UniProtKB/Swiss-Prot annotation, chain A:
Component of the COP9 signalosome complex (CSN), a complex involved in various cellular and developmental processes. The CSN complex is an essential regulator of the ubiquitin (Ubl) conjugation pathway by mediating the deneddylation of the cullin subunits of SCF-type E3 ligase complexes, leading to decrease the Ubl ligase activity of SCF-type complexes such as SCF, CSA or DDB2. The complex is also involved in phosphorylation of p53/TP53, c-jun/JUN, IkappaBalpha/NFKBIA, ITPK1 and IRF8, possibly via its association with CK2 and PKD kinases. It comes from the Eukaryota. The chain holds residues 219 to 316 of 327 of the full protein. It comes from Homo sapiens. Belongs to the peptidase M67A family. CSN6 subfamily. This is COP9 signalosome complex subunit 6. Widely expressed.
UniProtKB/Swiss-Prot annotation, chain B:
It is found in: Cytoplasm; Nucleus. Belongs to the CSN8 family. Residues 1-158 form the PCI domain. Its main location: cytoplasm. It comes from the Eukaryota. This is COP9 signalosome complex subunit 8. Pfam families: CSN8_PSD8_EIF3K. PANTHER family: COP9 SIGNALOSOME COMPLEX SUBUNIT 8. GO terms for cellular component: COP9 signalosome; cytoplasm; cytosol; extracellular exosome; nucleoplasm; nucleus; perinuclear region of cytoplasm. Component of the CSN complex, composed of COPS1/GPS1, COPS2, COPS3, COPS4, COPS5, COPS6, COPS7 (COPS7A or COPS7B), COPS8 and COPS9 isoform 1. In the complex, it probably interacts directly with COPS3, COPS4 and COPS7 (COPS7A or COPS7B).
Curated annotation (Swiss-Prot), chain C:
The lineage of its organism: Eukaryota, Metazoa, Chordata, Craniata, Vertebrata. This is COP9 signalosome complex subunit 3. The modification Phosphoserine is found at S406. The gene is COPS3. Component of the CSN complex, composed of COPS1/GPS1, COPS2, COPS3, COPS4, COPS5, COPS6, COPS7 (COPS7A or COPS7B), COPS8 and COPS9 isoform 1. In the complex, it probably interacts directly with COPS1, COPS4, COPS8 and COPS9 isoform 1. Interacts with CK2 and PKD. Interacts with the translation initiation factor EIF3S6 and IKBKG. Interacts with ERCC6. It comes from Homo sapiens. It is found in: Cytoplasm; Nucleus. Gene3D superfamilies: 1.25.40.570.
Curated annotation (Swiss-Prot), chain D:
It comes from the Eukaryota. This is COP9 signalosome complex subunit 1. The PCI domain is necessary and sufficient for the interactions with other CSN subunits of the complex. Mediates the interaction with CAPN8. It is found in: Cytoplasm; Nucleus.
């Protein structure tokens, strides 16, 4: 559901890009030769598309990934020890006494 | 490097599959020199201890390689370079010996760059086993600082999306069950 | 010889007619004819075929090795290699005791002849054939590690020692824990030889924690090596867990008193006094087959003093560093710092212009993809570990005893 | 130096200029380091307990 949820959002944006791309293709052949502030801005948004990142943003982006990634590692350890605890409890009844 | 590693693996396999239990002297020499190349001092020392004294007596080149290895263990770079260039190495040993020379040069260069904010020009020349002035010009073209008055050298210390998504899926699948 | 021919014919019939369990029980039967009758086994090997015929050949070979009449070892070794190469031991897992005894006898012969270099590969192949999974530890591993230690060739061992083998083989009840102790002691020695002090200490600790009701010299040597490795790595003797053991510790602690004295003097933290004690007790530590571990302990004490200085000093001169650590001069301190930096044990820098060593503050802020990759690598070990844990838990559920209590 | 060894001063001795610098380490760097050590110890203890099940399921002991 989480991935389909982002799949719908990307599809929504993907449909918008198709409309812009088709309009430019039609303008190259027919339509209005220049819709003025629209294609001017549409080009500006294709230039703003590569959001420039500096060293600090990649520093913080990797900072967030490592923090929760460690949290993910802790969650796996917590799940693993519970399975170990269940294994130990079952093993102490399988052959062991007391 | 990669070819040297493949040769080392092949020589180790040949040693393990030796018919009479004793490898040919070229194989032992290649093994020892390649262990010296990778700075694997423990493996080289154990291999030298494993070699019977009959090979050592019948092949003084093996003794020379062992002396070079002992010099590497003591990390006396001028002595290391002097000993390497003193003994004539056969066609199977000369290129790998020169590779060991280059590896030692790079190792000393990195150690000086890391540990030494300042170093005497003579000390750096001894560490690299090269004359002082051309070493100075080589480090100047390396973007370093050198003081002529005090003869001191100031070295300058220098996941794809597909792999991530696979790891993220393995996050959920492990926690899903 | 008629009885041997009848036995060969019976083995052939059981192999050709698909009688796996009948052949296994015939091999496991009395076999007095094989024991009393000899000099005809070569014809048995020649006439018999491979696969389970080769399993019968292996049984005959084990009978041969059980006798002192073993002849030309070269011809025997070629036959053993041919059997291993053409091995189809789909049922050798039943006659594990015979194979374990064969491996023990072969290793004893190799030690007697002082040729342990070639036995490493044969024992590796034997381990591969015997174990069900890579997570299985057998008695052959002890002999393999012994051969690696004697031959001073630790290269093959390290792969199969870096893997945790959590399935001990009963050897049909013939697995004496002496093999377990030998394997752990020799693996610890091999790891010490490769400067892998952490895994060597782990192996020594596991060997110490083995529940044993009697004293053995191998166990005492494992304890002594554990003390030495603990002194080298952590600078102190790691406390034995309350997971504990049996009379082992109770009798060792009185016995290994000299190593405890060495540990105490190490705790006093005086290189001069430590060297004086070592000279006093030289002959005591000479009974170790290695004296280099004491020099390694001294070097580790020097490195620990340097690290304690770094934990307290931000920048220290070479002269004062030599004075504090009691070194002969600034050059020795400079060389020690360079060697420690090369090994990655400290982050510092030396300024020869002013004769100062700058103990740099820890630059590792842990903000690189390498740490993320390392975390993901530990993940896959944990996920595989959890899957193995779940698999055993399912196997436990199959046990009738759990079901009988549940029903 | 003795106080640092005992504790409760949290300081570093820059003996070059003889200046005592206080230690203020980031929690995250220490947290990540010891968390990784815990995971390595947890895996090592996971191996040891995993090993212990071997000698008991297969009845392995000194006779």
């Amino acid at each position: 559901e989480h991935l389909i949820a982002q799949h719908s959002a990307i599809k929504m944006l993907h449909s918008r890009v198709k409309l812009i791309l088709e309009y430019v293709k039609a303008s190259e052949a027919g339509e209005v030769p220049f819709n003025h502030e629209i294609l001017r801005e549409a080009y500006a948004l294709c230039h703003c598309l590569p959001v420039l990142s500096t060293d600090k943003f990649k520093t913080d982006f990797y900072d967030q990934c490592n923090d929760v990634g460690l949290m993910a590692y802790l969650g796996t350890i917590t799940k693993t020890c519970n399975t170990m605890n269940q294994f130990v409890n079952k093993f102490n009844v399988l052959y062991d006494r007391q | 490097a990669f070819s040297f590693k493949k040769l080392l693996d092949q020589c180790e396999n040949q040693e393990l599959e030796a018919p009479g239990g004793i490898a040919t002297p070229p194989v032992y020499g290649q093994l020892l020199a390649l262990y010296l190349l990778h700075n694997d001092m423990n493996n080289a020392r154990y291999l030298w201890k494993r070699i019977p004294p009959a090979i050592k007596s019948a092949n003084s080149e093996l003794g020379g390689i062992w002396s070079v290895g002992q010099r590497i263990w003591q990390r006396d770079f001028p002595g290391i370079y002097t000993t390497i260039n003193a003994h004539q190495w056969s066609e199977t040993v000369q290129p790998i010996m020169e590779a060991l020379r280059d590896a030692t040069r790079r190792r000393a260069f990195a150690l000086v760059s890391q540990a030494y904010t300042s170093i005497i020009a003579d000390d750096f020349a001894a560490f690299v086993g090269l004359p002082v002035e051309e070493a100075v010009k080589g480090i100047l073209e390396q973007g370093w600082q050198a003081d002529s008055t005090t003869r001191m050298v100031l070295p300058r210390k220098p996941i794809p999306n597909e792999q991530q998504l696979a790891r993220l899926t393995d996050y959920v699948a492990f926690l899903e069950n | 010889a008629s009885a041997l021919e009848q036995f060969v014919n019976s083995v052939r019939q059981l192999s050709a007619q698909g009688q796996m369990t009948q052949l296994c029980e015939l091999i496991n039967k009395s076999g007095e004819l094989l024991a009393k009758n000899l000099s005809h086994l070569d014809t048995v090997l020649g006439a018999l075929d491979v696969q389970e015929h080769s399993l019968g050949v292996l049984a005959v070979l084990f009978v041969k090795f059980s006798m002192p009449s073993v002849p030309d070892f070269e011809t025997l070794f070629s036959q053993v290699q041919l059997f291993i190469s053409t091995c189809n031991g789909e049922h050798i897992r039943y006659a594990t005791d015979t194979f374990a005894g064969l491996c023990h006898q072969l290793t004893n012969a190799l030690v007697e002849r002082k040729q342990p270099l070639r036995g490493i590969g044969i024992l590796k192949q034997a381990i591969d054939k015997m174990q069900m999974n890579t997570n299985q530890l057998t008695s052959i591993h002890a002999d393999l590690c012994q051969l690696c230690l004697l031959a001073k060739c630790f290269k093959p061992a390290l792969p199969y020692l870096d893997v945790d083998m959590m399935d001990i083989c009963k050897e049909n009840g013939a697995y004496d824990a002496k093999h377990f102790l030998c394997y752990y002691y020799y693996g610890g020695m091999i790891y010490t030889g490769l400067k892998n002090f952490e895994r060597a200490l782990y192996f020594y600790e596991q060997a110490i924690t083995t529940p044993a009701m009697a004293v053995s010299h191998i166990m005492l040597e494992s304890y002594k090596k554990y003390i030495l490795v603990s002194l080298i790595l952590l600078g102190k003797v790691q406390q034995l867990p309350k997971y504990t053991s049996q009379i082992v510790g109770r009798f060792i602690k009185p016995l290994s008193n000299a190593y405890h004295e060495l540990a105490q003097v190490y705790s006093t933290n005086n290189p001069s006094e430590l060297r004086n004690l070592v000279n006093k007790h030289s002959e005591t530590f000479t009974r170790d087959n290695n004296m280099g571990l004491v020099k390694q302990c001294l070097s580790s004490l020097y490195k620990k003093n340097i690290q304690r200085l770094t934990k307290t000093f931000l920048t220290l001169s070479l002269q004062d560093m030599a004075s504090r650590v009691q070194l002969s001069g600034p050059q020795e301190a400079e060389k020690y710092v360079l060697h420690m930096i090369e090994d990655g044990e400290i982050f510092a820098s030396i300024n020869q212009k002013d004769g100062m060593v700058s103990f740099h503050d820890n630059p590792e802020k842990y903000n690189n993809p390498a740490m993320l990759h390392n975390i993901d690598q530990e993940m896959l070990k944990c996920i595989e570990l959890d899957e193995r844990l779940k698999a055993m838990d399912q196997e436990i559920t199959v046990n009738p005893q759990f079901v009988q209590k549940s029903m | 130096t003795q106080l640092i060894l005992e504790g409760l001063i949290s300081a570093r001795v820059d003996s070059h200029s003889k200046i005592l610098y206080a230690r203020d380490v980031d929690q995250r760097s220490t947290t990540f380091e010891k968390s990784l050590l815990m995971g390595k110890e947890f895996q090592r203890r996971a191996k040891a307990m995993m090993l212990r099940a071997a000698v008991l399921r297969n009845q392995i002991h000194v006779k």
